[PDB]
Amino acid sequence: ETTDGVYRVMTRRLLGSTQVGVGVMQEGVFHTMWHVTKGAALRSGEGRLDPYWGDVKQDLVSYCGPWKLDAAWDGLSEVQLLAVPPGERAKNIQTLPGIFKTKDGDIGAVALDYPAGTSGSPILDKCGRVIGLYGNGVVIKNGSYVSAITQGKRE
Amino acid sequence: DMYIERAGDITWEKDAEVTGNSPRLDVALDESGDFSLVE
Ligand SMILES: N#C[C@H](Nc1ccc2c(c1)CNC2)c1cc(Cl)cc2[nH]ncc12
């Protein structure tokens, strides 16, 4: 299946069927976070998806082709996390992002809490465009989770 | 072996559940792609 949309990334290596992450299918390319697949091959029915591009520091990986997602958060508007949690239905959660201030620049950050298996869930702008993926961030004093809006680069 | 299953369309839902705060955090990103907090 190469239909555009959001997909669960599953494994049968552990007890039963376990959801390790999520990814986006766009323009024939599957996009997810590196920590979900570790760059390993993926299966889609009888078909095989081989990795094309990856980077541990950006924590991103693309299958079948180069990274296609290039929309960006405008730094002002609210966004939607299309959370796809393990064993539960896809769900849009609107929020206004915060900021990760780094030595190399500021990045948007969504302060929403989901299981680690939700990694790779897309973050969308008002037009439905994918401005980045959820699943790489930090744990604050509160014990809560805050993820960066991790976006790749389209060549 | 890992596999994928379709979970839905990528669309904006008008009148979705609005939650979450907007924190400004000082962070660092290491060679392993792991974020950490500074102070
Ligand atoms: N799973 C996982 C995620 N962390 C991760 C784990 C390993 C690496 C990175 C991020 C990048 N570098 C390797 C993660 C995702 C969500 Cl959605 C919530 C979470 N809470 N604690 C970890 C956590």
From Swiss-Prot, chain A:
Segment of the intact protein contained: 1515 to 1669 of 3419
Name of the protein: Serine protease NS3
Function: Displays three enzymatic activities: serine protease, NTPase and RNA helicase. NS3 serine protease, in association with NS2B, performs its autocleavage and cleaves the polyprotein at dibasic sites in the cytoplasm: C-prM, NS2A-NS2B, NS2B-NS3, NS3-NS4A, NS4A-2K and NS4B-NS5. NS3 RNA helicase binds RNA and unwinds dsRNA in the 3' to 5' direction. Leads to translation arrest when expressed ex vivo. Disrupts host centrosome organization in a CEP63-dependent manner to degrade host TBK1 and inhibits innate immune response. Inhibits the integrated stress response (ISR) in the infected cell.
Subunit structure: Forms a heterodimer with NS2B. Interacts with NS4B. Interacts with unphosphorylated RNA-directed RNA polymerase NS5; this interaction stimulates RNA-directed RNA polymerase NS5 guanylyltransferase activity. Interacts with non-structural protein 2A. Interacts with host SHFL; this interaction promotes NS3 degradation via a lysosome-dependent pathway. Interacts with host CEP63; this interaction disorganizes the centrosome and inhibits host innate immune response.
Residue positions of the active site: H35, D59, S119
Annotated coiled-coil segments of the chain: none
Topology relative to the membrane: Peripheral membrane protein
Free-text description of this protein's post-translational modifications in UniProt: Acetylated by host KAT5. Acetylation modulates NS3 RNA-binding and unwinding activities and plays an important positive role for viral replication.
Subcellular location: Host cytoplasm; Host endoplasmic reticulum membrane
Positions of the Peptidase S7 domain: 1-155
From Swiss-Prot, chain B:
Localisation: Host endoplasmic reticulum membrane
Region span, Disordered: 8-30
Membrane topology: Multi-pass membrane protein
Cytoplasmic-side segments: 1-39
Region (Interacts with and activates NS3 protease): 4-39
Subunit structure: Forms a heterodimer with serine protease NS3. May form homooligomers. Interacts with human SPCS1. Interacts with non-structural protein 2A.
Free-text domain note: The central disordered region transitions to ordered by binding to NS3.
Name under which the protein is recorded: Serine protease subunit NS2B
Protein source organism: Zika virus (ZIKV)
Whole sequence portion shown: 1418 to 1456 of 3419
